[PDB]
């Protein structure tokens, strides 16, 4: 009967039926083969553990996220994500649901083709639709205008939408957030004598990326108050009992989203991708793009964004103009609440790709 909302994040892949309430399944995405020799002999241990059990098995597997820079690792592992989720998580039958898949706003072919085709031929789904993660965040906001931020691991995007079509000449994809922020946290945490070089153990870094990082009100002045060090040094406890005190690097890491030259990319910060996409939109329409800056995704849940972003954009944006940055609740599930609103909305059930139409066209004409 009901449609199935599946968001192909890199997180935190999200799954839940079409309305009326929250996603049923959230899990850390990973597939991991056992990287040691089994002298007890098992018995019968898994060839591949998927998440959640592959996060209950850190230090004994080699974790591989199923999508890497928004592209699949191979569809052999991707299919194990799908099969595991539908059968061994959700408990949903393949031929009893219209599905909804998500992709990035700008992603190369044949990643949506090969996907659409393999899921139709393998699981035999009776209807399918593929939405960009940004468009679903517009439905979640409820507004009819604005620049949309899908910032998730490992690809962020800046999509401007104006009632009710997408603007071709101002769509920006920045590869700055969020896996490069995980890897950067691992690169500046060595500065305090720690090591996390092991693939599974990198997850422990991801968990410290969640809880203790904070964005400065201004870089230069937090560097000033760092010279007065005490409150910056906060003590985290690590699963083997180790106590870690991070302070300067604590505000340095998130600070990356402004002035990203520290990572190694020449492209400018969230600051400039916001301004430069707005200043490629027509003069008259710009008026309503200002104050409809809408954030989304889990990688915008660092503390100090959006009011760093607000103060910085408001300084460059035109004089006597209104610029409020709209930050909803629970942004990590924003995208999903988008998908839920879409597939529940009448009459757009008949804007899906159904099995008879797929049988006719195969992997051709995906538009």
């Amino acid at each position: 009967t009901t449609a199935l909302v599946c968001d192909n994040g890199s997180g935190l892949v999200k799954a839940g039926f079409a309305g009326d309430d929250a996603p049923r399944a959230v899990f850390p995405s990973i597939v991991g083969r056992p990287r040691h020799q089994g002298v007890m002999v098992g018995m019968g241990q898994k060839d591949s553990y998927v998440g959640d059990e592959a996060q209950s098995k850190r230090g004994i597997l080699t974790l591989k996220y199923p999508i890497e820079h928004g592209i699949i690792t191979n569809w052999d592992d991707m299919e194990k994500i799908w099969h595991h989720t539908f059968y061994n998580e959700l408990r949903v039958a393949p031929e009893e649901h219209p599905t909804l898949l998500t992709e990035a706003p700008l992603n190369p072919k044949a990643n949506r083709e090969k996907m659409t085709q393999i899921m139709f031929e393998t699981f035999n789904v009776p209807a399918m639709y593929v939405a960009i993660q940004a468009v679903l965040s517009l439905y979640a906001s409820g507004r009819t205008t604005g620049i949309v931020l899908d910032s998730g691991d490992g690809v962020t995007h800046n999509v401007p939408i104006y009632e009710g079509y997408a603007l071709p000449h101002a769509i920006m994809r920045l590869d700055l957030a969020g896996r490069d922020l995980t890897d950067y946290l691992m690169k500046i945490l060595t500065e305090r004598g720690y090591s996390f070089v092991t693939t599974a153990e990198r997850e422990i870094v991801r968990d410290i990326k969640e809880k203790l990082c904070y964005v400065a009100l201004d870089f230069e002045n937090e560097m000033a108050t760092a010279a007065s060090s005490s409150s910056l040094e906060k003590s985290y406890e690590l699963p083997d009992g180790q106590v870690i005190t991070i302070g300067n690097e604590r505000f340095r890491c998130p600070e990356t989203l402004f002035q990203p030259s520290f990572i190694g990319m020449e492209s400018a910060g969230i600051h400039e991708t916001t301004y430069n996409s707005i200043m490629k939109c027509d003069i008259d329409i710009r008026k309503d793009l200002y104050a409809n800056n809408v954030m989304s995704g889990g990688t915008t849940m660092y503390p100090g964004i959006a009011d760093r972003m607000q103060k910085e954009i408001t300084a460059l944006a035109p004089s006597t103009m209104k610029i409020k940055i709209i930050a909803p609740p629970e942004r990590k599930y924003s995208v999903w609440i988008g998908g839920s609103i879409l597939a529940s909305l009448s009459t757009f059930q008949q804007m899906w790709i159904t099995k008879q139409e797929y049988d006719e066209a195969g992997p051709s004409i995906v538009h």
Partner: protein, 701 residues
């Protein structure tokens, strides 16, 4: 000419064919504009030449199928012709009311010494038939009563014993003890199930022995497949045994304060399932406030047409004095049942010097004191016996000592649960040995057995015990395929009539899938207890790991049903059987297969000071422990090889003797007169092999 169309409320209804093509057979109902749908070959069966005829034997019905067989039974339900000859199988329908003709003594006196088929179908037409083979071929006969639970397999059994004690001598010295003692042993073994409120959880087998001249010489009743797994886990609407609810309900306060009994909610083996009593309005107000559970204060008495727990406690103790049981020995029987209740209330924990061992909890100190008073073994000596693994070094050398290695907390709970199943096992064998003592047999030759065991059992929550019950039905149906189909077609060619020696659709690959060594399901479950860190998920995945494909089984993920859509890979398995595909959930499978004691619990309960407890554990179970005797056998054993040994031993008594084929059909779920369900009655014809036997036999004649 019309055909039969499957209807939801009638099962099968009459209807003509008004458009025809394979897989597009349009069947119009008879003078009804109802289900004007299309069918398939397995949804269309032909009808007879005329609908205004009903027959005693179904040998006169040419268009015989399941719709014409359920229609002959629907008409003979009206005319009260409950006993009906189907091929060579008696089908009996329970009318649930008193009909004088079946209770007439002239009916037994007419049928006295009369040949099968030259006289009407009746209960006494089967009991004379398994007596004429004693005079023809000189062979012993096993009466097997099959059918749904609460279908009259125990009540129709008393008609069979009444015919044998009236037409072939006066039989055994005093009959009526067998009739009186069946509700007595049903206190001990009957429980409450989803299928029927009064259901039997054991397979009794009466053995009436005779001599060379075919005169009765005595009796022996035993029991097969005891549901001891009901002790540890009761269920949700199911009860445990019916003796604990019959003992705490009405009995004295100068017996309940002394045996330290209390309301059902306090005891571990009564902390799951239904704690309510079966009662009626006068008996309910006779139950005192302290005897009520919180669920009884909330929902009161349970409803059954004949069970009254407070009523049945007087008819239990009257039936005890009728089998010769002394009132002081009834008090020793009450001390063992109360000792199981204060054994279950031992709660364990970890702690101590060993650290990885086990101790007991503080709140089980008042309960351990009442347990050592009831069993006859000391409290300190039971606390260092439940928690340890005794072994010795004497066998390996003259430096001998006997060490103790403390067990885990889960193995302390499994040893206490195995000690509780061991006491009730030998207690049930002591009650049937006390009744067997009053009618012993002298110089046996011929003998007439009467089986009373459950049919196919499947509902909303099936488990291990429903798989052992459905497997025992699958072994009996392969016995019936070589005794009802292979044997009878040898007899049509012994009269020169004709018919070929045609083969049936076998299930020998399924038999060598449940009990088969190495790759069978019970041989992978019995290996699970031998493993350290045993799990139901490892055992369920080990079946699908051992054989990837096999048409007799599938996991809930591969089942198309909605009920199985919510059940995961590691949560159950589905076996396709003669009665269809039945899912058995997996959880607590490790402990359900566990039922054994090592020497530290055996050299304490057997050696009890109490002669009664010591006699429950009678010789050779009780044996002296002494130097170099010389090995630690039998260790694990398991419920699955207890059941495989006791099932294959009854197969050697069935393959070696003649038999009678009786099926008892329940016409309505509420158990009252003049109500024909039609669809539930069809399910008892579809879960009893009736469709397959009435298609193979027909042939060229």
């Amino acid at each position: 000419k019309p055909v039969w169309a499957p209807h939801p409320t009638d099962g099968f209804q009459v209807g003509n064919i008004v458009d025809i093509g394979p897989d597009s057979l349009t069947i119009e109902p008879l003078n009804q504009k109802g289900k004007t749908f299309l069918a398939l070959i397995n949804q269309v069966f032909p009808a007879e030449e005329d609908s205004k005829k009903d027959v005693e034997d179904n040998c006169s019905l040419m268009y015989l199928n399941e719709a014409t067989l359920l229609h002959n039974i629907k008409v003979r339900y009206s005319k009260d012709r409950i006993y009906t000859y189907v091929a060579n199988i008696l089908i009996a329908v329970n009318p649930y009311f008193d009909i004088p003709k079946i209770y007439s003594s002239e009916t037994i006196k007419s049928y006295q010494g009369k040949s099968l088929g030259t006289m009407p179908p009746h209960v006494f037409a089967i009991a004379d038939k398994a007596f004429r083979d004693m005079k023809v071929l000189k062979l012993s006969q096993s009466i097997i009563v099959s059918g749904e639970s609460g279908a009259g397999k125990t009540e129709n059994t008393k008609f069979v014993l009444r015919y044998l004690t009236e037409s072939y001598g006066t039989g055994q010295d005093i009959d009526d003890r067998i009739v009186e003692a069946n509700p007595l042993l049903e206190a001990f073994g009957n429980a409450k199930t989803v299928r029927n409120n009064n259901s039997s959880r054991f397979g009794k087998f009466v053995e009436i022995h005779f001599n060379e001249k075919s005169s009765v010489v005595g009796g022996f009743v035993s029991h097969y497949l005891l549901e001891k797994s009901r002790i540890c886990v009761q269920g949700k609407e199911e009860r445990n045994y019916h003796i604990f609810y019959r003992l705490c309900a009405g009995a004295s306060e100068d017996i309940r304060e002394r045996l330290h009994l209390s309301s059902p909610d306090n005891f571990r083996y009564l902390n799951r399932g239904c704690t309510r009593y079966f009662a009626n309005k006068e008996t309910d107000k006779q139950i005192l406030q302290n005897r009520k559970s919180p669920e009884y204060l909330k929902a009161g008495s349970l409803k059954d047409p004949l069970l009254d727990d407070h009523g049945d406690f007087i008819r239990m103790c009257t039936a005890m004095k009728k089998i010769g049981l002394d009132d002081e020995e009834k008090l020793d029987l009450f001390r063992v049942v109360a000792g199981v209740l204060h054994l279950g209330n031992i709660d364990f924990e970890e702690a101590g010097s060993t650290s990885g061992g086990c101790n007991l909890k503080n709140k089980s100190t008042q309960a351990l004191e009442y347990c050592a008073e009831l069993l006859g073994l000391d409290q300190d000596d039971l606390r260092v016996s439940l928690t340890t693994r005794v072994m010795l070094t004497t066998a390996g050398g003259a430096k001998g000592t006997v060490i103790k290695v403390p067990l885990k907390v889960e193995q302390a709970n499994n040893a206490r649960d195995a000690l509780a199943k061991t006491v009730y096992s030998h207690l049930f064998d002591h009650v049937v040995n006390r009744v067997n003592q009053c009618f012993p047999f002298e110089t046996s030759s011929y003998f007439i057995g009467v089986l009373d065991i459950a049919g196919f059992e499947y509902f909303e929550h099936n488990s291990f015990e429903q798989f052992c019950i459905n497997y025992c039905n699958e072994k009996l149906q392969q016995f019936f395929n070589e005794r009802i189909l292979k044997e009878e077609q040898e007899l049509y060619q012994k009269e020169g009539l004709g018919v070929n020696e045609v083969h049936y659709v076998d299930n020998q690959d399924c038999i060598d899938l449940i009990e088969a060594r190495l790759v069978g399901i019970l041989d992978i479950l019995d290996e699970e207890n031998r493993l350290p860190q045993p799990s139901d998920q490892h055992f369920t995945s080990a079946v699908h790991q051992k054989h990837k494909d096999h048409f007799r089984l599938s996991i809930p993920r591969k089942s198309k049903l909605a009920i199985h859509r919510n059940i995961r890979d590691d949560e159950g398995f589905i076996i396709r059987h003669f009665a269809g595909a039945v899912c058995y959930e997996t959880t607590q499978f490790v402990e359900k297969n566990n039922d054994a004691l090592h020497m530290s619990l055996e050299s304490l309960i057997c050696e009890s000071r109490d002669k009664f407890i010591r006699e429950l554990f009678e010789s050779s179970t009780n044996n002296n422990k002494d130097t170099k005797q010389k090995a630690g056998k039998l260790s694990f054993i398991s419920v699955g090889n207890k059941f495989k040994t006791q099932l294959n031993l009854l197969l050697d008594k069935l393959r070696s003797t003649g038999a009678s084929f009786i099926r008892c059909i329940k016409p309505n779920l509420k158990m009252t007169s003049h109500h024909f369900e039609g669809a539930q009655i069809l399910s008892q014809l579809q879960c009893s092999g009736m469709v397959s036997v009435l298609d193979l036999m027909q042939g060229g004649f």
